[PDB]
Design a protein around this ligand. Sequence first.
Ligand SMILES: O=C(O)c1c[nH]c2c(-c3ccccc3)cccc2c1=O
Length: 438
Amino acid sequence: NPFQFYLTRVSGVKPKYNSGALHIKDILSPLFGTLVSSAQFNYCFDVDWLVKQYPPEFRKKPILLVHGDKREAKAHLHAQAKPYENISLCQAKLDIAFGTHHTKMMLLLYEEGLRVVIHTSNLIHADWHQKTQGIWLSPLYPRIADGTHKSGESPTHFKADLISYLMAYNAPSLKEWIDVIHKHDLSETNVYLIGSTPGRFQGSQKDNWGHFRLKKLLKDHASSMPNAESWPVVGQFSSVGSLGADESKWLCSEFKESMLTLGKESSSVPLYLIYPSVENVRTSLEGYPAGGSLPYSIQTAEKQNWLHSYFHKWSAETSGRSNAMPHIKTYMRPSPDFSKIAWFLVTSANLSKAAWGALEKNGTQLMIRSYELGVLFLPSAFGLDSFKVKQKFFAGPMATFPVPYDLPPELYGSKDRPWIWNIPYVKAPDTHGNMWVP
Ligand SMILES: O=C(O)c1c[nH]c2c(-c3ccccc3)cccc2c1=O
């Protein structure tokens, strides 16, 4: 395969459903490269656990943890890392209220080159145990010879775009990583970077981030087809923000409008949202505790009951993961019969204005609260007009894209409810025999 899109290993499925999956120990193995230094961008860290995932011979190499924690949470993280003299920390600035550092990325510097890993898992045991999570693995990027002057840039502009993302932090520890990236050849990269960074962007900067970044890439590098209006949009996520009193406020006015962009020319497009029902969580491998990582609050939900008529169950027989609750987030554009897709995005971004941006100041400014990161797969970047959907995620032309859940998505039944994490479920017990009492 040219796509290098993986799922994490799931404890409890048959071996055939983990053949081709990756655990964090696999990613950090010496088979991938001889580690010199690494940077771990994430939201939540268990530092004792994380160091144990590195190979023993690499556990004293420098590690930088890039996080967004403040005040007592910041102190707690520093306390976790103090026993490890080789670990440094970088607090990403969050100057807009209610923002978080959600980006999940590894920079892995080797003797042999550099690797970039953009993924969806927190650095804690539970996120790699029984969840559905996504990983994109970059090629091994070779170093540019000292004295040679080459750009090292890809046709997707990935090198410049990754440097731009890191520059937004304005952090000394990340200037060091920017200099590392400048020294490597990333020309083989076949994905586009889609990032969010906190701020208020107008003018030339409007298209740099968030859903306007996605819109710009789809305008420039995808083609519109006849009957495009019949190609649905699918969004699949693990959390939902406050989207407003009706769909016209944000979901179907600016978010969907960016997502349905194709080509440079100038809505009844079906919108499918995939989000675990209560029954999905109850019967999952983890049981109700899986809902601890699906943080949809009742306060938000009760203000937007209109949204739930868009919701479809989690189903993933194609990858044997129907009972492995999703923490991956994906967005894609399938054909009307779900046999092809016009593009696929894997990202940290949930269905929220904080992650994707919301227009302000009479439509002239995009305000984003959070850091997010994902990679976009476009057929044009692979010499194709569309991707055929792989029918079985782990089965065997390698130009078919491995969609990790079932299509078409299945609408909630009349008795289904979206998982809401801060109310009790006492009607029926989970796979471990327990109820849920927040
Ligand atoms: O990395 C990620 O995707 C995650 C980000 N926030 C999470 C929260 C949370 C939500 C609101 C306020 C504080 C915490 C709770 C449970 C899991 C997550 C989580 O998994």
